[PDB]
């Protein structure tokens, strides 16, 4: 079976998220990188707990290493999506996304539900 | 953190946060194989007779031609931070025994 | 007798909005129920669950295995969860959990039901 | 090295407008060729036939049986018959007879090809 | 008449006349079982490099989940009144041997 | 298998034509009757060879028996579609159709390609 | 005040024949008997168009729906008899609402 | 009973048509919808008279005078004949009192 | 203002050129009174069975409420430049006698 | 009545042309000036015989006087419309128009038929 | 200039109201008559104070004189628009309008903001 | 046959009052005299909505178009006053097609 | 014609009621000259941070080419009937001195 | 080189902004697109002055005078502040010289 | 850097003539003098199309909007005359932004 | 002629800060150093909105596309320092185009 | 203007003098963004089978990342100022609609 | 079943094209290793001689290939190809140096 064989080789891709990669040494803020099925970088996502924001924590010079290694990003727009809690995420967070394509293209290449 | 870690009984759960709370969520075993699609339904919406119509369309279509082995409808267990009851409507892609084995729970 | 009636007479029972329904009696009350269109194509798989059981945290595990296995490979297009009851024939609130094998618009078209 | 390149490197060859192609070498030149999208889903089955053979009334019987049988149950959405050649790589006019397993719009979308 | 009669090798061929000449046509055996879907392509259009895109959509979808056993591409044989060459692009639903048997040709 | 069982029982229905019935004693003019998947009468179709028209043949009092047995037809529109020759039809014909629903409904219930 | 109903001259075989000119040549034409009852609906088709395999789709819709015909007795397909002025041959596809005997009678055929 | 029935029938596409017999063959003819509204005023002329350079002057005066208000919306010029009941080609010159869609609607005629 | 050359029987003719050849033309009398609306139809089109539907809409609507006295349908007389025969379908807003006077036409 | 009185007190406006003015000494080329019912200048139109164009006549420094007296024009687009021959226009002409509003606004304020 | 000259020679037209006239002896109810730039009657407007309505005042046989002098009206629709208080209108009022053209034509010929 | 024309009650001052119930409360209501002549078109406006500054735009369009009213004799704006079952005050915006004297006469008011 | 009661400082005010309360109002002087365009903004809306975007479009466009001499922003003075404070944002087409005269305002 | 650079930057949503310093704090400010076209004239007023019934009379005369032609399309009144750089609530009273879509386009600002 | 402004040839009487090739043949062409000032907008109209009665509607819209021309000094309608490679006659519809004397000067014509 | 570029007062830590008022409160705001170079893009988000789980989608699009930023050095998420007039707390989500050291330097932090 | 003008439909054009006449020419929008790279070739040279190899290498090298969106091949001339037929081969770096928008040209 | 890649061609390597986009394509040329070497538009000389205007071609392909760097461009008359009669021009967007191109595609220098 060719289809089963291709899918076996193919990296996991989660509709609405993409194929994710994150340098574990940059957690928990990240940012994680989201790629489409063709392997192009779609967005760079920073993660922050709401609690810390409520405590007025100051995040400074974040994602420097990752961004430096990325090179050209040409940001199209920004998203700030709330997340958590739910199985897997113990507290509310916000995903701060730097999207490198139009909002419609992002939904399109990441196969995500319209906002 | 905001990213998922393998949890016994559920596996590693991924989800497009903009589709919360229902999702659906994709659950993978440690080897990164998709085990099930999980809709996280707040029991509260069900008690208000909310009509869920055409949900999980993008995710399910991404499965392409597939085989659904069975369905589970399980009440959410204890989960840190979670404060309301939900039901896990699950479309499992492997046998109930395969599922229990690879999810380690 | 006219040909139309003879045709109508030979065609399986079809209910607008539900289709032609079949279920394995041994799988009741949950099912699943299989809904076919007028062409005999399987449109959706429907699980029936009482709301009260959900509120009492009943654990439904490995449901519809026999029925599902008998189906075969297929794409799943989307899911619906529709509230039902009570009313004559249904003594308490239920939820229809539906695994639909065609687009939501196609479902409403081939089952001839009112649009959502 | 960046992650994007490592990903691109691990992904099968995909040609915009054609998809990821595979064919049983023993079935050439006719095939059929199987075209998959980036998700690894089979999009279409393509038979290759030289126009000259059609003009000389060649009889093609029981074609693609081995390949087809290996597939499985599936819906067929539509058929295309697209002319091809000559050009580098194709010495004479051919026709691509395609059995497409998704809508024509979905085909153009998942294979990322120019609209018809 | 304008209605079809069982013809050896083809069976009983039905078609929505508004889709002529290509159709596609549906071929049934004497017991009324669908044997194959047949597109009747004028060889002339092929020589003019006509691009057939998205044809037989309504008929094929009517087949629902099916299995295509094999394909035939056969030049039209002698047919009363027919004056131009066509190719029968056939999507057969049974084995080539089953096909020859039930079509009596 | 329920699907195979249902389809086995179901009468043949040809997309764009419907489920056809014709009183053989009324051939070759007919008319044949075309029904949808629910068994409703969609159209009444008369058949005539082009050759006869070219010879000025006079068709008179056609389809009387069939029409009498039909009762209420309430015609919506008329179609005149050419047909033949092709495998199965030795000479050109015209299908003169009396359609009992709108032209869009006819295409819809008979699952036919748009005109 | 000085008007009167406009009514075409009776024509043996065709009765009082009306037609919306913008729908010509096909029509349909409406044929009435002396008493003012509708006898038949007639589509006037050029044989040339048929030999050209013209596809006639959804014709006479507004007319047919306005009349609300529910009973068609029979159908006629007759070659265009000689008519003063008409040079090309047409076929009269008639949807007759009464019997063939009543038709010839009421239309003084 | 004196129940009037010599009234013309409403014909889809034409409406209920009246004409002053002393104005024939040109008319004009008056077309009314089912409610009794005057929809259009129609003049009929043989194409042959036109080719023979005939001069139609001060036509339809009597009729138009008895109509008073009009407010014309558009004009149509429709060819007709030959066909059974019309031995020679004519043109229907129509002065329409409602928009073109309204005219097809109230007269229940086939769209243009 | 900028009035064009008065024409006997036609008066001062105005027409939107984008609507030629039919128009319709608006004919005014010396005093600026609208006397008639003129559709100039090439006989060739009539002979070819051209179907004219919904013409003059804008002009007729801008002219609004009023009354039509009579209608004329006269073949194009001698006009410099014009080379194919036309017919003038006219909707006159005054009596035929008043028309012959204001338009100073024979 | 008021209505009838108003129209009489209003300048002659021709559907599709507007209210025209032209400096007599600039005839026959003009340009003519077309105003809407509010008195706004809509377009500046130059009249040229087609025969002159075919004769390669040189029209230079045209409309200077009239244009000077206009001031702020703001050209939106240009049209070149053929005209004549017909009563009042003995030969074919072309109207060269410098329009000061969008093309749709033009047909709208001059109450003319769409192009 | 011509443009400036034209406007001066033209009647006062107010966007959204048109050119208004009212028989002084019918004040304060009117009706007022609103004309477009071509001098066509667009609407007939009656003015009533809201307080009178709340006092159950009986307005009977209003606008008879003005209406008689109008003749052919052809009512398309009615509007009831609240007005005031503001400078020039010491108390809340309602404008009862009998409009003689479609609602879109009304906003169009009176050059007013859409409702 | 056994079917007779169906006609609402005659309200002195209002006559035979008809109204498409789907257009309530405003209507317009149509008031006919005994003979079957339309005497006036009545918009039934709730005072409460006027106090709320409701903007009524394009009302009675289809009805007015269907009636084809070219001549309004006079307008009345009068309080509805009490009516059995009616608990909210309304104003009658009336387009009367006949003289005020004829109106009092035929509506027996 | 039917002119409303002249107001000192405002002149003859006209406004399309469907656009109240902001308007804009058109203020003319005795002679029928448009003197200024007035937007009447309820202070309450300003205090609530209301976002006014694209207002007065139709009126301003119908008034066309011209020049704005100066702008005024004055609180609503005493006006019978008016009960909430407003601000009059005015686009004046004449000098402030000429404004005080034609509008006969202090 | 005398290559001028003390020129303001084009800011998406604002354009290139100029003001006569002797007209501050009200201005008006002049906003230009990239081609150099004047898009809008902006007046700035503190909400507090409005609440204190301040009277702004004959404002922006000098500036408006030096602009001559204008042809105003619409008006905007936009609230602003408090935020870094603006300690008190203000309103931006804008006289716009192009349609509202054109203004967002040429100034390249976020849609309203 | 090594990049210099790219400028077309200077045609006496026409200057530095620019044109978006996708809008050919009509253009409009834009003619600049040596200093870089726009001297005139030129619509290049084929005589053949005029003889065919072609209707030119809404031409030069984007270009005119981009130039923001509020003052036209004068208009010229002159024959293009011969040009190397040009075999069809055209008329130059010109919107000249400067005096006719300045035009002859700066275009060195 | 008497004008001058409108330029907001410099603000230690924020530089010359611009914002299109219609995009408030979020902005983004654009921060420039004395030399006129863009230092960072700042979205000013109300903490209240975040606690309400507001979904911010596609913000700063026109601005970000007009600037054509290709290199982001780092990101900052800082609580709203005390600002004259600002009562509610916000978070400054900053996309910084230079190094953290250069930032504090050029913005005279 | 002390630098090349922005021309509607073309933008602001730059070219390496030594790469003439083929170029490529670089077209910028009003904001200074590179919109497209244009090669100019005479039809005549194509008909004579001239081989253009390794063109625009210098200029392309000093440009950098481009991310090509689409290609246009537009015929030009003859007309006043262009004595013979040429083809403009364009490598456009934005969508076709965006190109028309930022270079403010007439729609295709 | 295995990689169905076509036969290596000298100077064009493994060549792919979406048959529905013929004749221009563009074609994608890969080296033995499966790397993309160049994108090729095959334009029939006849079309150019006919002044055909090509606008927005190759969009889906180019967008999918996210080509950020083009090393050089070639415009070569079409080499001799079997069955290929009509002359074409190859507009090539090469992603590698001229040397590397000749090397990896096994084509003559």
Q: Identify the biggest protein-protein contact and residues per side.
A: G-H, 37 and 41 residues
- End-to-end span of chain A in angstroms? 36 Å
Q: What is the CATH topology descriptor of chain A?
A: Phosphorylase Kinase, domain 1
Radius of gyration of chain A: 15 Å
Q: Give the strand content of chain A.
A: 25-35%
SSE ordering of chain A: HEEEHEHEEH
What is the helix content of chain A? 10-25%
Tally the structural domains of chain A: 1
Known CATH architecture of chain A: 2-Layer Sandwich
CATH class of chain A reads: Alpha Beta
- What composes the largest sheet of chain A? 5 strands, antiparallel
PDB class: unknown function
Keywords: Alpha and beta proteins (a+b), Unknown Function
Entry title: Crystal structure of hypothetical protein TTHB210 from Thermus thermophilus HB8
Chains A and 17 copies: Hypothetical Protein TTHB210
Q: Care to describe what's here?
A:
The structure is cut from a larger assembly and holds 18 copies of chain A. Chain A is an alpha+beta fold and 115 residues long. Chain A has one domain (1-115): Phosphorylase Kinase, domain 1 (2-Layer Sandwich), CATH 3.30.200. The first copy, chain A, is built from 4 helices and 6 strands. In chain A, strands 1-2-3-6-5 form a 5-stranded antiparallel beta sheet. The N and C termini of chain A lie far apart (36 Å). Chains A and R meet through loops of A and loops of R. Chains B, E: InterPro entries: TTHB210-like, TTHB210-like_dom. Chains B, E: This is TTHB210-like domain-containing protein. Chains B, E: Residues 29-74 form the TTHB210-like domain. Chains B, E: Keywords: Plasmid.
């Amino acid at each position: 079976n060719v289809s089963e064989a291709l899918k076996g080789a193919l990296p996991n891709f989660i509709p609405g998220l993409g194929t994710l990669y994150v340098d574990p040494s940059t957690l928990p803020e990240g940012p994680f990188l989201a790629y489409d099925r063709a392997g192009n970088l779609v967005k760079v996502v920073f993660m922050v707990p709401l609690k810390k924001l409520n405590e007025s924590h100051k995040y400074v010079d974040i994602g420097t290493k990752t961004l430096r290694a990325l090179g050209i990003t040409r940001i199209d727009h920004v998203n700030m999506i709330p997340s958590g809690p739910h199985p897997g995420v113990s507290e509310p967070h916000y995903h701060i996304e730097l999207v490198l394509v139009s909002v419609d293209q992002e939904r399109k290449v990441l196969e995500g539900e319209p906002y």
